[PDB]
Structure 1
Amino acid sequence: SGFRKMAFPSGKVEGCMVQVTCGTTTLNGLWLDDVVYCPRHVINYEDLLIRKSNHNFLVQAGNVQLRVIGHSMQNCVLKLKVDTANPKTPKYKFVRIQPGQTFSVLACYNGSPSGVYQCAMRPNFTIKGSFLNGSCGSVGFNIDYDCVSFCYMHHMELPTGVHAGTDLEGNFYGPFVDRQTAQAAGTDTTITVNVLAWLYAAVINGDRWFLNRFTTTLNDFNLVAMKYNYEPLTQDHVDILGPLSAQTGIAVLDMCASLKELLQNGMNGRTILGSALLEDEFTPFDVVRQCSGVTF
């Protein structure tokens, strides 16, 4: 029993974190094999990079200085070829995630991991992280059995306090750019498929006060979702919620009619899984995993 915001064990990622210094700027890098990946803003980026030599980049792994033997840029990521392969390199992939998907973040400062938390890629492509100055280069990941799927690298904080970054190939999530200019997060929406998954988790944990005898249609429900700034629910989302629907005996449109009543009436002084708000940062897969015991 119990339902917590759970991150993946971070150990496989801790062994890849390094400190990258270029002049006055110091941030984090990801050391995989003989390459260190870090935000290119550590340095017209091609014109600024052409003036740099390998020895201008100081890379530190624990108390050992790594020697940079080459450098190149791939989109908004700087790739530093080093003289030593990381012996702690895990099995890995670089994956680009979609809004609504969740991941773990290992927040780092000076190449030293300080904390781990779970978060989701918002529909507006920002993340509500917890980062201070020096956190740039911190990474987001998921674990699939023994393989680490790197999906995010931290680059910046927007004026509202939310965060923006890229996949490990340097492509930003969202209409953001890596430079000081007027940038703002778009109007955010609630991840509907995730709220439904969390209502199923509550039912599994013995919280059923919100269940009712009613059902609805995808058309009728999506009109309600549009009214309350909720993301549209698709047939794909309904199909993905299938296993949870069969485990609890509550049809997805049946659970949608419960969410509709929660949206139109509120919680009436009650809580669901210790929360007075409808949680949208647990995917259907996160719920199935936390209520089964999948290990890494």
Structure 2
Amino acid sequence: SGFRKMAFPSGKVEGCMVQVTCGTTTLNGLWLDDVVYCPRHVICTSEDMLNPNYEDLLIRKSNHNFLVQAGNVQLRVIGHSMQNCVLKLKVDTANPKTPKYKFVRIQPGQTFSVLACYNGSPSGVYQCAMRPNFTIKGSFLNGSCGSVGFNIDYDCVSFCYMHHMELPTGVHAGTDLEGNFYGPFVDRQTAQAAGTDTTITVNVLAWLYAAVINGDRWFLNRFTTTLNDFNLVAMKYNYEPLTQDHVDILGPLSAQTGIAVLDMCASLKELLQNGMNGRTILGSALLEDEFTPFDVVRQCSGV
């Protein structure tokens, strides 16, 4: 028993982290097989990184300006091709330690682990959530660009996030490995505004089932609602809507606790309306929404 922010094992990825240097500009990149993916803003200078139009700058070719060192090995680059906001560099050796890997675009609220990497070496690993306003609140210093976010389903590693920028509000913005930014952000050195962020109701309901599994009962009540009745009190508190798709994803947790999803909604609705009453749940006086229903199942049932 117990619960915690339990990130995936990093090692499997530790193997696909390299350092890319374009001129004197250096950031990380992910090396799968005979190809290295990194953010397209390595080519720039400080002077270029305010409104750069990168199209021309890569047609300013020179494969030989692209330095990659993968630990001991000095990777030769044998190609230079740009897919949106990621550069995909052909290299001479295929990463011998390449696992099974997919690329997926995550929907807001879904979770991933991040390997914080600096100069192709990693300092630590943590778990993030995709904020409904397409931001991640992680831990990134300069040189973190090219750090990657991933989920491990069984054999396959899903790479969901590639880090690009810290915004003025202090949170983060990046891309899938197709260089397709989440949110309204660009590869430019300009303050950007995320939008408005919202608490993820399915994840809170996940975390409340989490508390139950570790023998916290103080929040439970003999009341229920409809989804309709819940969904107004959600809108009111800038809590996401809960749908039938959201109700279906919690069933495992319902089954294993024996509390019906709509009753837990009754518990969440009274918490929203009266506050956390001085008390903590899972040692947090704050509603936590950075645990997915899957992640509860995983952490509370190994895997």
Smaller-chain TM-score bracket: over 0.9
Deviations 1:39-68 (A, max 9, x none): 001111110111131110110101321000
C-alpha separation in 1, matches of 2:96 and 2:212: 45
C-alpha separation in 2, matches of 1:163 and 1:62: 28
C-alpha separation in 2, matches of 1:4 and 1:188: 24
Deviations 1:198-227 (A, max 9, x none): 100100110110000000011111111111
The alignment partner of 1:47 has SS state of: helix
C-alpha separation in 2, matches of 1:283 and 1:181: 32
Query: RMSD of aligned C-alpha atoms?
Result: 0.7
Cα distance, 1:87 vs. partner?
0.4
C-alpha separation in 1, matches of 2:187 and 2:112: 22
Cα distance, 1:269 vs. partner?
1.1
Cα distance, 1:259 vs. partner?
0.5
The alignment partner of 2:80 has SS state of: strand
Deviations 1:156-199 (A, max 9, x none): 11101100000011101111111123411111100100000110
Contact 2:168 2:191 in 1 (8 A): no
Contact 2:167 2:191 in 1 (8 A): no
User: Are 1:165 and 2:165 counterparts?
Assistant: no
The alignment partner of 1:255 has SS state of: helix
Q: Which of 102, 113, 121 pairs up with 1:112?
A: 121
Cα distance, 1:289 vs. partner?
0.8
Deviations 1:231-256 (A, max 9, x none): 11111011111111121111111001
C-alpha separation in 2, matches of 1:95 and 1:10: 18
The alignment partner of 2:233 has SS state of: helix
Q: Which of 249, 257, 260 pairs up with 1:248?
A: 257
Cα distance, 1:26 vs. partner?
0.6
Deviations 1:79-122 (A, max 9, x none): 00001110011111111111010000000000001110001000
Contact 2:254 2:260 in 1 (8 A): yes
C-alpha separation in 2, matches of 1:74 and 1:218: 42
Structure 2: runs of 5+ lacking an equivalent: 44-52
C-alpha separation in 2, matches of 1:39 and 1:182: 18
Contact 2:227 2:262 in 1 (8 A): yes
Contact 2:17 2:28 in 1 (8 A): yes
Cα distance, 1:132 vs. partner?
0.2
- Report how many aligned residue pairs link the two structures: 294
Cα distance, 1:24 vs. partner?
2.1
C-alpha separation in 2, matches of 1:243 and 1:9: 24
C-alpha separation in 1, matches of 2:167 and 2:191: 9
The alignment partner of 1:159 has SS state of: coil
The alignment partner of 2:173 has SS state of: strand
Alignment of 1:10-159 (within 5 A): 10-43=10-43, 44-159=53-168
Contact 2:35 2:88 in 1 (8 A): yes
- Percent identity, aligned pairs only, is 100
Contact 2:27 2:144 in 1 (8 A): yes
Cα distance, 1:3 vs. partner?
0.2
C-alpha separation in 2, matches of 1:208 and 1:182: 45
The alignment partner of 2:116 has SS state of: strand
C-alpha separation in 2, matches of 1:145 and 1:242: 22
C-alpha separation in 2, matches of 1:243 and 1:70: 48
Superposed structure 1 runs of 4+ greater than 4 Å apart? none
Contact 2:162 2:176 in 1 (8 A): yes
**TM-score, with structure 2 as normaliser:** 0.96
C-alpha separation in 1, matches of 2:71 and 2:168: 33
Alignment of 1:132-281 (within 5 A): 132-281=141-290
**TM-score, with structure 1 as normaliser:** 0.98
Aligned to 1:290: 299
